[PDB]
Subunit: 328 residues, 2 copies
């Protein structure tokens, strides 16, 4: 059982210096500060050590090339990462590494492994334990659950139960103290391959009452390649007392304008409301039931090779790697 563990940094590797926690520790250190004696062939490697909120798109490319070269070398990979953008990393890796031959699992903790009442060891233990199950794909393991990477979302900013599988079932869960596989995500084909590319300049804006289209017109001028509007619920772009809908109608013919929802659960459905149909007709691309992190990283990923609106729309609505549920 050859396991490779890559560190990216994160709360899990920090310590309360002068101005709050700051990522500090090596992967070998952390590794030992836990039940590393659960002897299986292991090996640590520090790719980086940053507070998660500093992670940028390039770091995902760096991490993906790394994994790519090693997918044949080990039986499974574990990545320690900061919780803040972990869902973004997991999602982007899922688009870049198609048909992974081995389980890749991202994990971290809410408190430094260097404290007590720390979730870090439990999380690492769950992550190692899952790779022994030989269930390939890209997942996140946290608080006793293993979730498909592109369906996971961080919904709590402080509690140990920080992640959730959104609109899709957990892959594994602790049952009577032992990981139990609840279901095996079967998207994965045979031939593995990397599709490492992306356009990072996209803008996410929350719709609020009275929002004008001015900020959308100007994002185009500033060079943004895609715009995601985080809407109210099931779907609709306001046109009452605002020029937002008028502005979206034409910007949507120049760069992809995606509509997702503020609500954590259920996704969007532009067929539900008449206001939603009108938006669909104006060129807006629905995000289905995808998590916010997979929507953002999938658009960046798609813009990595095309600027054609109809092709962006077709790819956004296609289930690439388990991120999206068959729409009616």
């Amino acid at each position: 059982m050859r396991i490779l563990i890559l560190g990216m940094g994160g709360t899990i590797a920090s310590v309360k210096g002068e101005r709050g926690y700051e990522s500090a520790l090596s992967v070998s250190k952390i590794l030992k500060l836990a039940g590393i004696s659960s002897e299986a062939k292991i090996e640590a490697r520090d790719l980086m050590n940053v507070d998660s909120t500093l992670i940028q798109p390039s770091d995902w490319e760096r991490l993906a090339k790394e994994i790519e070269k090693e997918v044949w070398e080990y039986d499974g990979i574990v990545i320690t990462h900061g919780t803040d953008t972990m869902a973004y990393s997991a999602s982007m890796l899922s688009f870049m590494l198609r048909n992974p031959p081995i389980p890749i699992v991202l994990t971290g903790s809410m408190l430094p492994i260097t404290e007590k009442n720390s979730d870090a060891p439990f999380n690492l233990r769950t992550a190692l334990e899952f790779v022994k199950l030989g269930i390939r794909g890209i997942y996140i393991a946290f608080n006793g659950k293993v979730m498909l990477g592109v369906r996971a979302s961080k919904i709590r900013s402080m509690g140990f139960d920080a992640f959730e599988s959104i609109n899709y079932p957990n892959v594994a869960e602790i049952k009577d103290d032992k990981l139990r596989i609840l279901h095996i995500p079967d998207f994965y084909g045979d031939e593995f391959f990397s599709d490492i590319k992306y356009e990072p300049k996209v803008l996410v804006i929350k719709l609020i009452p009275g929002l004008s289209g001015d900020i959308v017109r100007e994002a185009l001028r500033l060079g943004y390649k895609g715009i995601i509007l985080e809407g109210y619920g099931v779907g609709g772009i306001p046109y009452r007392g605002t020029d937002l809908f008028e502005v979206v109608s034409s910007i949507s013919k120049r760069i992809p304008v995606v509509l997702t929802t503020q609500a954590i659960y259920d996704g969007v459905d532009l067929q539900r409301y008449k206001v939603g149909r009108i938006a669909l007709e104006a060129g807006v691309i629905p995000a289905g039931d995808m998590t916010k992190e997979a929507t953002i990283t999938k658009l960046m990923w798609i813009l990595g090779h095309t600027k054609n609106i109809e092709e962006v729309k077709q790819l956004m609505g296609k289930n690439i790697t388990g991120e999206l549920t068959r729409v009616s």
Copy 2:
């Protein structure tokens, strides 16, 4: 027991037609179609019938002036409204009409009343039952629970349990088919204050990896009077490989720059991490544990009264009407 029911619109006043749901029913008809007991005690009044997602800030002025003039003539007020912006309306109303003398409850439904299994009659009955309990304040009644308006947030775009009281407990809940009060908010004062003034032009931007401050400088140039950055976890502004921190450092001195979190539970804590402390140093205002809706609406309300930064900072940090929790 004199109850006024004001209609604003929403899914509850709509009917699923050949184009999806759309406005169509007045308050009287919703009550008749819901089979609600009678109208000799209940006064039904339409203020407007606007489709779900189309509510604009000036509608709140109209609603607040109506309420203000009727709080001393009825024992309770129920407002039928769209779910998409209901929490913004409950929140804004709470800042505009402090210390109301009677219970004001907003309700709606996920399914039009003419659809099978509609939640509309149940939500309506719940609101009317809460109004007779004579517990003053502004609330949202939904799926058998009554929650403090300023603490409610819409977390589902389709499920019946669409609203949840965030970082604060339910005020009432159905138990043995009866509405039992779980706790009475007690931060109301003696005088009914009416402050119907606000600045609507604020902007909400989610923070994502790679995001530049260029869009933030552009928002100031466009006339935005405040900006909310939806951060990653407990709070922080990415200053690595991006000029976002640099731009926020200058912008925060001219207009308020508020930091909330993408997470829905636990809120912001700007002292926890190094990144968080640099943000505070940079002039960013923490939203604490407030709901996104309360945060947006309160910022708008404060800007209708002062443009002075430290002053805006004091008010955002002050618990005005139960929207936020102590030691911050």
